[PDB]
C-alpha cells in the first residue's frame, strides 16, 4: 500500500535529482556554510594565533 503510493508519485520537479547517498551532505552544507561564514571573524583570529604554536 505504501510501496504503490510511492511508485504512484511521478518524478518530482519540485525536488532535486540527486542519488540518496548524497542527500545528507547536500542538506547539511547550508547550515555548515552559514556557521562557517559566521565563525569567519573567529577563524581569522585563530590563523593570527598559529604563530604562537
Amino acid at each position: 500500500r505504501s510501496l504503490r503510493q510511492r511508485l504512484a508519485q511521478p518524478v518530482c520537479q519540485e525536488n532535486l535529482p540527486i542519488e540518496a547517498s548524497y542527500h545528507r551532505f547536500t542538506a547539511e552544507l547550508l547550515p555548515l556554510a552559514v556557521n562557517f561564514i559566521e565563525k569567519l571573524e573567529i577563524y581569522i583570529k585563530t590563523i593570527q594565533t598559529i604563530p604562537k604554536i
Binding site: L30, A33, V34, F36, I37, L40, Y43, I44, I47, Q48, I50, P51, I53
Partner: protein, 98 residues
C-alpha cells in the same frame, strides 16, 4: 565580510540572500567563496606552511599526566590504609597501656 562585499560589488555581481521569502543557496555559496578568500589570505601571512599539532606528543603527555595523577592517588591512598593505620593504632595502643 561587509567591508569586503561593499567594494567587491562593482566586479562581483551577487544577488540577494533572502528572495521572495526564501533563502538563495547560490548567494550563500557566493558569500562562502569570498569568506574562504579571507582564510587563504590570512594563511599566506601567518600559516605559510600548514602548522601541525603533534597528536603523539599530546597523547604521550595526556598518558603521562594520567600516570602522575595515578601515582599521586597511589601514594595518597597508601598513606590512608597502611601508614596512618599503623601510626594511629600504635598511638592508641600506647595510650591504652599508659
Amino acid at each position: 565580510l561587509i567591508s569586503r562585499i561593499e567594494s567587491e560589488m562593482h566586479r562581483l555581481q551577487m544577488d540577494n540572500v533572502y528572495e521572495a521569502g526564501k533563502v538563495n543557496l547560490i548567494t550563500v555559496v557566493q558569500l562562502l567563496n569570498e569568506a574562504l578568500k579571507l582564510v587563504s589570505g590570512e594563511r599566506s601571512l601567518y600559516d605559510c606552511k600548514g602548522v601541525r599539532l603533534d597528536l603523539q606528543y599530546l597523547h604521550g603527555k595526556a598518558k603521562f599526566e594520567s600516570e602522575v595523577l595515578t601515582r599521586l592517588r597511589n601514594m595518597r591512598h597508601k598513606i590512608k590504609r597502611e601508614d596512618l593505620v599503623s601510626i594511629e593504632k600504635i598511638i592508641a595502643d600506647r595510650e591504652r597501656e599508659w
